[model samples]
Target: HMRLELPVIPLRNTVILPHTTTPVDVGRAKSKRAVEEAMGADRLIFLVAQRDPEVDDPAPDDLYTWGVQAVVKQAMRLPDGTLQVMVEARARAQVTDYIPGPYLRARGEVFSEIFPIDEAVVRVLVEELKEAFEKYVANHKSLRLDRYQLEAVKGTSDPAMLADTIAYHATWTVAEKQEILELTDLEARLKKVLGLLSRDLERFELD
Candidate 1:
């Protein structure tokens, strides 16, 4: 039921996806130790986005069952008095056993889903997302929205990357994104992401 055992970084208010290298601040005592543990022996960590960002010290149930195996790309302790770590998310994993001590750790494994049907409509899905996202981020000033920079859109021989990247870039609640994290069906995951985006696009209509 379980395979890889690694340190757990219960991120606050954010979800990190495989193929993305993201920076996170380690403020909690347990989080700091978890990262340090990863740097030794093996530079891998399992990142679980906390269900509630408000909970400073998260229990096992406080985290979503889904997470990712990440490699600690870089870590530095700042003079400003904080630990900043850059991590590259790898495969999707489900935690079986979550244990806490001086730091938190989990026993989990990576997964790859099988679609029940063939995927021939990849273009339509990507098209709708790109179109909506174009205006979606345009409504917000601070977003790192890019046009040609997103060659990854047409480059989708895989749906997982697209879904992960979309969910990562778009502004959504930690809990909302966590749902996408646990979604195993590749096509369903992408559609759900588009739905969330378009829903926001309509709801947050700037006009």
Candidate 2:
């Protein structure tokens, strides 16, 4: 059992997945402290989305059961008493034993990927997901790949990687994105991506 106590940074309206980097604007006092404290210790922190963005000080129940273990890639303190931190999600973890204080801290159990789908299933889902991803990129101009986006999307054939990349980039609600992050089964994760992409296709057709 791999467990670690990390400073918790509760997010609003966003989900972070392993293998993706995201920038967080930290204005809240506790959250800023969490980043600083983590930077001071090991450059590791727990990134969990709060169910309610309105709650500045989240109780245990206000957070999701799962979080991503993230490493601080860069941290810049703004002149206006705020921080801009770039973090890379490293793993999915189950948040446990919330200890609330100046900065949030919690125990986490990180999970690993399990391949349950056969080769045939992997092929089917992979092709379908790729086609859907292309369509998704075509229809949503904002998600269109520039050079940086191209680097993230090009030449990725690993099923698990495809699923995580799409889920990270997809414009789903925080809750929906969390569903993908929480999935232990790769097949189920791909299915969720397919569902979301299918929905995107439908919306595009309607438009």
Candidate 3:
């Protein structure tokens, strides 16, 4: 169950995906405090994409209503007050109400977007998603992280997880990838990844 009050960090042009662990540098003065407050308490933070291109404390209008809820795991706080932080995305959330704070905090109406999956269509999409990711990995040289590329090929994961894994690893704008998080439908999610992946492959092929 999601808590009533959740602290949020407006990630800079980035969306952390569920079933994925990510490294985001927490350097902004306001965000660092929110990070500490969450770590000391429930170790949970709603990571919404920042609509503000430049802001120390983004106004409510500067954030997207929907976001990923992440759990803080390992972290290293630098001498200059920045932190090299690691987080695991748990679920997508919609924060309707907000309480202004050192950064921004969620007050109420925070709903989690974890839904049931349909199989036949999803299964086919999963297979297609995997193949697209494998091919994308084959051609995209620098993005060939062993963990991600190998996991997509040989690993067994749900369509949602597969779509997210491939989405994060792909070289696309945060907005582009953030759409994957916004999409709650499994079939649609995988197909979007396929579209993005295919586009990347085509870039490599020049066709």
Candidate 4:
């Protein structure tokens, strides 16, 4: 449901996975230009990875490759003269059409649409999440308050809501979080996440 018109700053080996909310450091000239233009516009941006690094002059043909859609949640300009901003993944969108238009208008095509589980099922999961979150907090009391609040979210069976909550609190890598984001099947996604949490709890017990 969320979309953005952003410029293309192709990363040779980097691919933006949908639904991932992570902070990125933009240092290059083109990446900086892209981030600045995105902030100036609607604050929504598209991040795509390049297959061939040799192709410096990337056109629509070049960008027709791959990427994800995200929004500028936070942008910090360091005193040392650099930008460190956090972009939250909105969806897994592929480049449908790329053209050198006003600040890189990319037609993003959704590859996966992972929804929330059924309300009945979600009700049960939310309770489980609440318990898991409480224990998580007990284990690490020094964690920020908001982190605890996010984990303790209860009520309703929205898979996206649950998944986002866990993903936000999760310490997994960008790729691991990205994998969770790209999955559209609500039930399957929940299982994958719960499995991860179960393992974390096991480790906690061992500790």
Candidate 5:
């Protein structure tokens, strides 16, 4: 139950999940400033999605409570004056309050994965998730998964890791993915993810 204040960046139509690396091109002045502050402080930033992607200046109400607390792994300025930053999602966090400043900052309560269900059930769901995920990757030829993603789907034994890995690669809508991000309970997350994967499996089979 640890709470910490971290720099925040609001994204449009994007949700970052733990155990995944995403490259973001930041052009807005405020967002770039937030990224800079995070890099200067601890290379950590809370990436939250905006409720309305059209909003330029998002208030607290405009953003979703659950977000990825990510570490800025690589940062550089693009030739066009935008910042190209590569970040790895570390943990999911809930925004407690927004701190007003030149860039957004917030008090975040971090959520770690919790398992309070039967081990056998968790194991079965994990296997089913991976199986559905493999089907997903195989059916969608246009989608190319990275090495980390491939290994996670193929080799990961931990339920939490497998769930996050599948979520990272799962082609769910941004809103649907946000819902998954909000669920911290491992069993709930796995079940929900399995449902989503199954829906995709069915859709692809229909195609």
Candidate 6:
């Protein structure tokens, strides 16, 4: 339940889908070690973020309260001496403790088990979300991507992870990411993600 201490990116609204992979760049030495260790496990470390501890303030802090377990899918050296890593989700955990080696270690739980949904409703919602997102992407100038790449993988039984990943990497502020991270319920999290993308896109349009 406990591991060596390491700093965490505490985020919500993003689900690190089990068995799926995303790439990250390792900056610090401890984080590099963490990535190496996690890769060796053939399972990834969970990447979660901390909630702002202040009651009425929004400021970035030096520590986080939670993170997720992700499997290391690929790790390679970059030209600049940094490590480029691809990790996949394995489970969810809560931080029971932490220490600093410039890294935060926490004890957490492995809860990768799926939460059942009303299949009909989930289908309808997922479809709606996809449509809303597509429109949101088209009308917004910031979401430019290689359409071919994204289109190749759309709706392949792995869309949730990809959707959540896009939401995670989107222009959302850290606090918003934290909100998504805390919502563990499948349906609620999915809804929250749609709202996150919509609000951000709307804000961009108004700006």
What 10-residue stretch in candidate 4 is worst by lDDT? Answer: 147-156
Query: CA lDDT of 191 in candidate 1?
Result: 86
lDDT of 4 by residue, 18-50 (tens): 545666776666677878878788787777655
lDDT of 6 by residue, 1-207 (tens): 334333343332233434445677665566666666555564446565435433222123443444566666777887888787776655455645554444444555655535555666666657766776666666676554567545633553343564455564455666665565556776777788788777766777886
lDDT of 6: 0.56
Residue pairs in collision within model 4: 114-184, 116-159, 122-157
Ranking the candidates on TM-score from highest down gives 5, 2, 1, 3, 6, 4
The sequence of per-residue lDDT tens digits that candidate 1 reaches over residues 34-124 is: 9889998589889998888889898888988899888998888878667999999987899769765677888898776555465666556
The candidate with the higher TM-score, 2 or 5, is 5
| Candidate 4 positional error at 203, Å | 1.5
Point out the higher-scoring one by TM-score: 1 or 2: 2
lDDT (CA) per prediction: 0.80, 0.85, 0.77, 0.63, 0.85, 0.56
Q: Assess candidate 3 and give its lDDT.
A: 0.77
Candidates sorted by lDDT, descending order?
2, 5, 1, 3, 4, 6
The sequence of per-residue lDDT tens digits that candidate 5 reaches over residues 109-204 is 888777765888898888888788888888875676877668757898888878877876766777988988988888898999999888877888
Cα lDDT over the full model 5: 0.85
The TM-score measured for candidate 5 stands at 0.94
Give the Å error, residue 167, model 1: 0.6
Model 3 residue 92 lDDT score:
74
Of 3 and 5, the candidate ahead on lDDT is 5
List runs of model 2 lying over 4 Å from the truth: 141-145
Clashing pairs in 3: none
Better of 4 and 6 by TM-score: 6
Per-residue accuracy of model 2 over 1-207 as CA lDDT, tens digit each: 368899999997778888888788888888988888888899989999999878878878999999899999898877877789999988899998888577789989987777774878987999898888878887885663565665456578788888888888878888888999888788888999899999988988896
Better of 2 and 4 by lDDT: 2
Cα error of candidate 1 at position 55, Å: 1.2
Candidate 3, position 205, lDDT: 86
The C-alpha local distance difference test score for the whole of candidate 2 amounts to 0.85
Q: State the displacement of the C-alpha of residue 102, model 1, in Å, after optimal TM-score superposition.
A: 1.9
Better of 3 and 6 by TM-score: 3
